[PDB]
Write a protein that binds this DNA or RNA. Structure first.
Ligand SMILES: NC[C@@H]1O[C@H](O[C@H]2[C@@H](O)[C@H](O[C@@H]3[C@@H](O)[C@H](N)C[C@H](N)[C@H]3O[C@H]3O[C@H](CO)[C@@H](O)[C@H](O)[C@H]3N)O[C@@H]2CO)[C@H](N)[C@@H](O)[C@@H]1O
Ligand SMILES: [Mg+2]
Ligand SMILES: [Mg+2]
Ligand SMILES: [Mg+2]
Ligand SMILES: [Mg+2]
Ligand SMILES: [Mg+2]
Ligand SMILES: [Mg+2]
Ligand SMILES: [Mg+2]
Ligand SMILES: [Mg+2]
Ligand SMILES: [Mg+2]
Ligand SMILES: [Mg+2]
Ligand SMILES: [Mg+2]
Ligand SMILES: [Mg+2]
Ligand SMILES: [Mg+2]
Ligand SMILES: [Mg+2]
Ligand SMILES: [Mg+2]
Ligand SMILES: [Mg+2]
Ligand SMILES: [Mg+2]
Ligand SMILES: [Mg+2]
Ligand SMILES: [Mg+2]
Ligand SMILES: [Mg+2]
Ligand SMILES: [Mg+2]
Ligand SMILES: [Mg+2]
Ligand SMILES: [Mg+2]
Ligand SMILES: [Mg+2]
Ligand SMILES: [Mg+2]
Ligand SMILES: [Mg+2]
Ligand SMILES: [Mg+2]
Ligand SMILES: [Mg+2]
Ligand SMILES: [Mg+2]
Ligand SMILES: [Mg+2]
Ligand SMILES: [Mg+2]
Ligand SMILES: [Mg+2]
Ligand SMILES: [Mg+2]
Ligand SMILES: [Mg+2]
Ligand SMILES: [Mg+2]
Ligand SMILES: [Mg+2]
Ligand SMILES: [Mg+2]
Ligand SMILES: [Mg+2]
Ligand SMILES: [Mg+2]
Ligand SMILES: [Mg+2]
Ligand SMILES: [Mg+2]
Ligand SMILES: [Mg+2]
Ligand SMILES: [Mg+2]
Ligand SMILES: [Mg+2]
Ligand SMILES: [Mg+2]
Ligand SMILES: [Mg+2]
Ligand SMILES: [Mg+2]
Ligand SMILES: [Mg+2]
Ligand SMILES: [Mg+2]
Ligand SMILES: [Mg+2]
Ligand SMILES: [Mg+2]
Ligand SMILES: [Mg+2]
Ligand SMILES: [Mg+2]
Ligand SMILES: [Mg+2]
Ligand SMILES: [Mg+2]
Ligand SMILES: [Mg+2]
Ligand SMILES: [Mg+2]
Ligand SMILES: [Mg+2]
Ligand SMILES: [Mg+2]
Ligand SMILES: [Mg+2]
Ligand SMILES: [Mg+2]
Ligand SMILES: [Mg+2]
Ligand SMILES: [Mg+2]
Ligand SMILES: [Mg+2]
Ligand SMILES: [Mg+2]
Ligand SMILES: [Mg+2]
Ligand SMILES: [Mg+2]
Ligand SMILES: [Mg+2]
Ligand SMILES: [Mg+2]
Ligand SMILES: [Mg+2]
Ligand SMILES: [Mg+2]
Ligand SMILES: [Mg+2]
Ligand SMILES: [Mg+2]
Ligand SMILES: [Mg+2]
Ligand SMILES: [Mg+2]
Ligand SMILES: [Mg+2]
Ligand SMILES: [Mg+2]
Ligand SMILES: [Mg+2]
Ligand SMILES: [Mg+2]
Ligand SMILES: [Mg+2]
Ligand SMILES: [Mg+2]
Ligand SMILES: [Mg+2]
Ligand SMILES: [Mg+2]
Ligand SMILES: [Mg+2]
Ligand SMILES: [Mg+2]
Ligand SMILES: [Mg+2]
Ligand SMILES: [Mg+2]
Ligand SMILES: [Mg+2]
Ligand SMILES: [Mg+2]
Ligand SMILES: [Mg+2]
Ligand SMILES: [Mg+2]
Ligand SMILES: [Mg+2]
Ligand SMILES: [Mg+2]
Ligand SMILES: [Mg+2]
Ligand SMILES: [Mg+2]
Ligand SMILES: [Mg+2]
Ligand SMILES: [Mg+2]
Ligand SMILES: [Mg+2]
Ligand SMILES: [Mg+2]
Ligand SMILES: [Mg+2]
Ligand SMILES: [Mg+2]
Ligand SMILES: [Mg+2]
Ligand SMILES: [Mg+2]
Ligand SMILES: [Mg+2]
Ligand SMILES: [Mg+2]
Ligand SMILES: [Mg+2]
Lengths: 271, 48
RNA sequence: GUGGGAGAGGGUGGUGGAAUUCCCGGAGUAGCGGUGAAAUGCGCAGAUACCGGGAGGAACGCCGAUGGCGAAGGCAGCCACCUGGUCCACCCGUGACGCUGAGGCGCGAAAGCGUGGGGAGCAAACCGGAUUAGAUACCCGGGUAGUCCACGCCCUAAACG
RNA sequence: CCGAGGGUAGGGCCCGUGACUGGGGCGAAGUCGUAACAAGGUAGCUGUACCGGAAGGUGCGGCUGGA
RNA sequence: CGCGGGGUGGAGCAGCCUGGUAGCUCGUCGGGCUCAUAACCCGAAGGUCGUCGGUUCAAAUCCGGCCCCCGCAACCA
RNA sequence: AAUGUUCA
RNA sequence: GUGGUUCGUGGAGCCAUGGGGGAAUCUGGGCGGACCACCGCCUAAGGCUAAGUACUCCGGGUGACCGAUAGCGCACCAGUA
RNA sequence: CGAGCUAGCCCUGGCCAGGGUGAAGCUGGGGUGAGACCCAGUGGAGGCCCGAACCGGUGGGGGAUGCAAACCCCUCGGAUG
RNA sequence: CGAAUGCCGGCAUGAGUAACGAUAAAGAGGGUGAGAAUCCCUCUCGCCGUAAGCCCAAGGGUUCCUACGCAAUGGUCGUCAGCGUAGGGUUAGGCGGGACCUAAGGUGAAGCCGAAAGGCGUAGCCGAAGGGCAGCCGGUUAAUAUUCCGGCCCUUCCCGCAGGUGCGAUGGGGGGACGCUCUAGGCUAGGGGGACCGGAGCCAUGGACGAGCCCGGCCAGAAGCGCAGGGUGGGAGGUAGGCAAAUCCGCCUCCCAACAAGCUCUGCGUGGUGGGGAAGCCCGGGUGACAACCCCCCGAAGCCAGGGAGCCAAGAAAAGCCUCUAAGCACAACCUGCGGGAACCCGUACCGCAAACCGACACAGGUGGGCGGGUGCAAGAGCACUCAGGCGCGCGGGAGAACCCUCGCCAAGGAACUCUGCAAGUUGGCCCCGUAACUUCGGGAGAAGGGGUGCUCCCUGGGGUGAUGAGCCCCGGGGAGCCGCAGUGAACAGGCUCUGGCGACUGUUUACCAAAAACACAGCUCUCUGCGAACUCGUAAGAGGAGGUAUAGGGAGCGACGCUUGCCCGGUGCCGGAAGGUCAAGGGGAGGGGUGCAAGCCCCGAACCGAAGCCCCGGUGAACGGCGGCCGUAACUAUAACGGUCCUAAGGUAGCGAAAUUCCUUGUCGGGUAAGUUCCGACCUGCACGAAAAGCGUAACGACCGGAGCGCUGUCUCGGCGAGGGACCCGGUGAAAUUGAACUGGCCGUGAAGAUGCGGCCUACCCGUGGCAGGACGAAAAGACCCCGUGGAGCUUUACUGCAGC
RNA sequence: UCGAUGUCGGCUCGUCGCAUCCUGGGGCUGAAGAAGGUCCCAAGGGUUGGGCUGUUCGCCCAUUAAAGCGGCACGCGAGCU
């Protein structure tokens, strides 16, 4: 839905925020070895190596389960659906019959009360994980793994998802969120359903700050700087690049493909 | 107005200290050069 | 009220095959395509033509009507679910409760507009090739918004019997 | 106290006028094309959308007051 | 004052560079189709090639003195 | 395959 | 490829190396300035080895060296204030 | 050799008188077939308003071997972000 | 040595000049002494009082206290001092640190990397204004005190002892434990009154013996005791988890019970009792005293605290502490009592918004935390006055010229000033009336324009606390009445409106000449990137990205929102093309050469097979980018819908247009003005607008830039008077740039072309002081501009040549 | 003159030149008068306030006897802006 505001103050006549009803029934994290001190920091060993990051509200890190073959067959009830500052997606706190509690990136549709489980035996329904091989071609899934046992790495952003296009050998063909067609091993797990909280792509930040609360500091334009700072910089009084559009490091930034050519990763791609 | 020198005992020790000067090969050379010139104070004398 | 009937009435979810296009594989060779005649264009980088595998979107052939449904706009593969109208019969119930309807409220093809999706074919604008004195057109080869969905708007018409 | 009026300040309605501008009516024989009336030689009409010296042209659907 | 570009039948453009030939489109003229006009068909006429000198055997064409033309630069303070 | 001055 | 040498690609050997191929043990093997052939030199892929040589923080001795703006930055409580 | 100035970021603490405006929610009333919606009441939102501390440095004047190698007076901008 | 703006030192000149450092302010009487405006005491006076007063951190290191002293240091003086000499002075189980814990980060066994130096880095260790932890009220010294002492109250360890229990980890679990904004109820700190309690005293000057005036009416405090709160369901069974070792967690299952109770844990009163105890008066001490030590009211931002509500940006760690079992050990061992004993190290002076810290200075600058009383004003930490407490700023005394600075007032006029209303005025708080276009419906709004405002008396409504009732406070409502020029009577305290330009908006910036139309910004588009992501740093290891996964992350441009964003893929870039052209090693060896008597050994070397790149083919604009000319033509003329032709990759669309763009140009009309090179509206031969280096608009916003009005003013006609601080004079102290030497006049000539200095002529006794700036081509800076030097740097690219990278 | 001679305009203070814009004398006149025109002598003293622009300069508005020209480093920044 997204909450909109009356225009009492500008920057807030455009501002809009998430429908937090989805979450509710729980704001406090499941402390139980669930959150960890999370180190902030826009740089590595001294130098900033990603520009314009910093500041941004204090943040606790919820550790979530991205490889569910741990508890194969051990079912669990969905305790709650909480808020995660560290992601676009919302998480779900799930108590296992085992007694062990874990977190999972909350799929769309999942509800407090439902039961869930991962395994080959597992029934094909929202929240359940299984190797792609045992998932019916056509079903939508999220939190897909890339190589087996390596853990989930695909379709985890709010409202994202992958769809099975069909098997072919030990591999199964997935159409990824981006839209690329990749062959992924059949043993790679993946939980059924879409990522959920798809209204996300619609929230309008609103003001200059807030972009700040999210830890994103101002991004200054190339042309605005000087010959020294960027290739675009310079020229007496406003100019048009004057070079084919380029990054501060000098590589062309409009259309120039960048992924490695001889990458073995290919052969399993097509899109 | 707020001037350049703002004395901090701990900062001074941790920066120009003896131990500090010892860790870095550059510093060890400082201690060397000074000791060899005859300085009475090899390091910024400061008491705590 | 009871007991029956017919229908593309409306919404939601699911699904079927033919066909167009694109992708992959196989085979195969100098044309294909287009027209009034051509040209642009596509094709020796292996096109057209034919076989096999795949993605995808849109539309529903034959039944099919000079038919049925709705108040209108309008509604056509098939399944289910949710639900609106309507007709017949029995002569049972209520007992004039009726008709129209200023204003109000609800609906309202197509085009067009917003937010997000989607995009095979088609196709305003737009670019080419001709035709013409001219050709900002009819023709041809391409092509974007649109057409498609969801939600929110627009409320017009030869909204015609 | 009220009080005709006078002042200052802000509003509402109407009339006159205004460089310039938009389209309309009207004026025997000016200019360009030929849309419509006969398949008006691209059936016409129409609401809507873009384009074009101009009438008009095309897309999408609707009409028969065309076949 | 500077750089270099254009001057040709009536219109707009060729040809000059590697001097000997002025070519295209348009129009203008006569003749056809029409009932007549346009389009179309047929066939012709039309150019001191800005001007004034010397190079040559020969000058649209090479060379310089002007003459309208067209552009570009004119700055530092 | 455009067109056909005006008033009778 | 390079480096070293007087040798800067030169006719460029020799002595070193990163990379590739890869022997033989005296009928073995390197060199004598591309390369061949003679003639001759020497024995690689393990190691050690005084003296003659270099310097002057230190002790001494001298000086056609200075003599407190000189001579060490300091003749003095100077690498101090 | 320097981030004891300045710039950015990281960890951990502190601070922001007093006024004003009065969003969303709720609660009751109204409305309708049910709604939309409209009222009051409560409520206390906001890189909102005024304005000290605090953070600045807009215009003018003074100062110019200064009080000061950037200062003073009046004025002025922000002030829960 | 005579010059090098030479080097070092000395001493001059300016000059008894500027200045003596905040315009908070001084006067006098006593002392002291060789000598006092300046030291000590007293009495007047003025200034501060969210301080110019207290307390703590940092830094400073003896300055602190006392006795002696004055050369120098205190911009004068100095008997004084932060100065000189000497001697004292800093006391802790509880305050703050360490024999505790962890943060960022640092270091760093293992482990990884790197010519060496060295770089990452696990465990561990280090790291604190954060966590954890036991001390209150008084009293003393010249100088210390939560440190010594008094009273009251705690903390660890060790021993003995009685009484208890499965005791026991560096392991498990719980916990510690956390945001922002808004808030309830009690409290407390703090403050105000009192007809009440205690007091020495005072009736002045016209009055008052007064329910008068004046002073003061508390602090701490175990257990118990109340009053507020914070925490918390009890049971009983199973169990696939807690890298299962558990009767502890966690999970299910099930009797009871729940806007609770009890159980716990704080806060606050209360408390045995200890402690403090003015004004005044007499010499810090006494006295005031065996001082009283009570009652109302206001009341926190603090306490109960882990209280509650709402919100999105979703808010440290570890130890102590509970609990659980492991080995083990059950003679251990822990637990509770109770007495005895034991209890280390470092800091403690003083300054601390400043004369002791950072600014070379006893420098109008800078410096984190807490307290910060009273009255009045709507409120307040604001403003005015004032407590406590602290100051009068380390040169003075006169004179009352110009001129300057800071300040007050002004006839008549009222922007005529000027680049410009620059500056100054006006307005100003609160209550009430009452308010337009336009808009994104919030706003514009404090629009504008107005009225009221003091005190006196009467009537009258709600509340809080009490108790319902009186006091005490908090909000009000209505009549009359008094006095001034004036009632927010002083101080704090908007001038307003109309119409343009630019950017949407709050915000950022050139520390020290630019605060802006610049940057950023939400938002739009393009592009890269399937995760060992792209991209960035690094030789590497490794790291950031990200414990993220395209609803994500990198790069680019545009820059809210509205309506929109045309045509040209010729060139350039980028994307796509398994064909061809070309192409390096390398493979391949037709063929040829050097030598040997030779087998040989050596050299060249064509066909042909050989990547990426370039070529070629095609796409591509919110990719670099680009988006025409010349003739003719209507039945008055003008003009040209229409036509011809040349060129192109295509010839600029909507919209805007003499503009932040228009040269000609003050374009031409219209508006405003008595007059308008600016402004607004029109037009359009746009020298040279135009669509994301976006185009045209837009409510609101702006210490942005332009044009008008009203109000109001010394900005001006046009200047006048007045005040304070300098200037001037006297006493004290006493600089600087500059300076070839000077005995340094005018004119007209002359001269290297602008003469005190040459020529001629003309004035002119010697020397100062207060003023003014025409000259000394005055000072200050080896001219920035300019040119030059085969000088230097920063920047660019289809300049050359390399290197990283790919 | 570059080991520096501050550059436009304005304001303030002027002084001079005179080829005279006023005001004084005067001769011609196609001078009737009143006017004017042109030349001659003569600066003693005069030679306004606004609108527009940085302007100098101009052009306007309202006046005037007239609203003169020009030099003084396009006089004057150790006088201001
Ligand atoms: N006719 C009146 C309205 O305006 C237009 O009509 C106007 C024009 O089309 C028309 O112009 C015509 C022209 O079309 C035709 N081909 C040639 C003719 N000579 C012109 O005629 C015009 O001009 C002449 C003077 O020159 C006048 O005398 C005459 O009245 C006038 N109509 O003149 C009309 C003015 O009245 C619309 N086409 C018409 O449908 C509409 O109703
Ligand atoms: Mg380091
Ligand atoms: Mg930016
Ligand atoms: Mg740099
Ligand atoms: Mg560059
Ligand atoms: Mg420019
Ligand atoms: Mg459907
Ligand atoms: Mg194929
Ligand atoms: Mg097939
Ligand atoms: Mg479908
Ligand atoms: Mg039905
Ligand atoms: Mg009946
Ligand atoms: Mg539609
Ligand atoms: Mg649409
Ligand atoms: Mg098509
Ligand atoms: Mg077509
Ligand atoms: Mg669109
Ligand atoms: Mg569908
Ligand atoms: Mg719809
Ligand atoms: Mg419709
Ligand atoms: Mg009008
Ligand atoms: Mg027709
Ligand atoms: Mg037709
Ligand atoms: Mg037609
Ligand atoms: Mg068309
Ligand atoms: Mg049709
Ligand atoms: Mg006719
Ligand atoms: Mg007639
Ligand atoms: Mg050997
Ligand atoms: Mg000697
Ligand atoms: Mg010496
Ligand atoms: Mg001597
Ligand atoms: Mg710092
Ligand atoms: Mg409300
Ligand atoms: Mg604010
Ligand atoms: Mg202010
Ligand atoms: Mg504010
Ligand atoms: Mg000199
Ligand atoms: Mg000297
Ligand atoms: Mg003086
Ligand atoms: Mg005072
Ligand atoms: Mg200290
Ligand atoms: Mg002295
Ligand atoms: Mg002393
Ligand atoms: Mg110890
Ligand atoms: Mg290290
Ligand atoms: Mg420690
Ligand atoms: Mg601590
Ligand atoms: Mg706690
Ligand atoms: Mg108290
Ligand atoms: Mg008396
Ligand atoms: Mg009291
Ligand atoms: Mg007590
Ligand atoms: Mg209780
Ligand atoms: Mg129990
Ligand atoms: Mg259990
Ligand atoms: Mg175990
Ligand atoms: Mg303080
Ligand atoms: Mg000091
Ligand atoms: Mg000091
Ligand atoms: Mg200084
Ligand atoms: Mg100071
Ligand atoms: Mg104050
Ligand atoms: Mg002083
Ligand atoms: Mg002083
Ligand atoms: Mg006056
Ligand atoms: Mg007056
Ligand atoms: Mg003026
Ligand atoms: Mg003036
Ligand atoms: Mg002006
Ligand atoms: Mg002003
Ligand atoms: Mg006020
Ligand atoms: Mg406004
Ligand atoms: Mg702005
Ligand atoms: Mg500003
Ligand atoms: Mg936008
Ligand atoms: Mg921009
Ligand atoms: Mg192109
Ligand atoms: Mg080769
Ligand atoms: Mg070979
Ligand atoms: Mg190739
Ligand atoms: Mg004509
Ligand atoms: Mg006529
Ligand atoms: Mg146009
Ligand atoms: Mg103009
Ligand atoms: Mg204009
Ligand atoms: Mg005008
Ligand atoms: Mg464009
Ligand atoms: Mg813009
Ligand atoms: Mg502003
Ligand atoms: Mg601002
Ligand atoms: Mg303005
Ligand atoms: Mg004055
Ligand atoms: Mg005076
Ligand atoms: Mg004196
Ligand atoms: Mg002279
Ligand atoms: Mg002379
Ligand atoms: Mg004098
Ligand atoms: Mg002077
Ligand atoms: Mg020089
Ligand atoms: Mg040169
Ligand atoms: Mg010069
Ligand atoms: Mg000089
Ligand atoms: Mg003059
Ligand atoms: Mg004369
Ligand atoms: Mg000056
Ligand atoms: Mg001066």
């Amino acid at each position: 839905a997204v909450k909109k505001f009356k225009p009492y103050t500008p920057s807030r006549r455009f501002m809009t925020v998430a429908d937090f009803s989805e979450i509710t029934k729980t704001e406090p994290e499941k402390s139980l070895v669930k959150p960890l001190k999370k180190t902030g920091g826009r740089n590595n060993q001294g130098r900033i190596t990603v520009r314009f990051r910093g500041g941004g509200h204090k943040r606790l890190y919820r550790i979530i389960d991205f490889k569910r073959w741990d508890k194969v067959g051990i079912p669990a009830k969905v305790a709650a659906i909480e808020y995660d500052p560290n992601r676009s997606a919302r998480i779900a706190l799930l108590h296992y019959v085992d007694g062990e509690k874990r977190y999972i990136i909350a799929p769309d549709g999942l509800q407090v009360g439902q039961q869930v489980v991962a395994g080959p035996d597992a029934p094909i329904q929202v929240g359940n994980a299984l190797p792609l091989r045992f998932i019916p071609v056509g079903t939508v899934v999220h939190a897909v793994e890339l190589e087996p046992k390596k853990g989930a790495k695909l379709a985890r952003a709010a409202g994202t998802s992958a769809q099975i296009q069909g098997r072919e050998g030990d591999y199964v063909i997935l159409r990824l969120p981006s839209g690329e067609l990749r062959k992924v091993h059949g043993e790679c797990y993946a939980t059924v359903g879409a990522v959920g909280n798809a209204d996300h792509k619609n929230i309008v930040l609103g003001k200059a700050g807030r972009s700040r609360w999210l830890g994103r500091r101002p991004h200054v334009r190339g042309a605005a700087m000087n010959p020294v700072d960027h290739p675009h910089g310079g020229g007496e009084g406003r100019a048009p690049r004057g070079r084919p559009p380029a990054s501060p490091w000098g590589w062309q930034t409009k259309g120039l493909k960048t992924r490695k050519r001889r990458k073995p990763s290919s052969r399993f791609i097509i899109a | 107005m707020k001037r350049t020198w703002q004395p901090n005992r701990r900062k001074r020790a941790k920066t120009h200290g003896f131990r500090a000067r010892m860790r870095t090969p550059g510093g060890r050379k400082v201690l060397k050069r000074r000791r060899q010139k005859g300085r009475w104070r090899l390091t910024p004398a400061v008491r705590k």
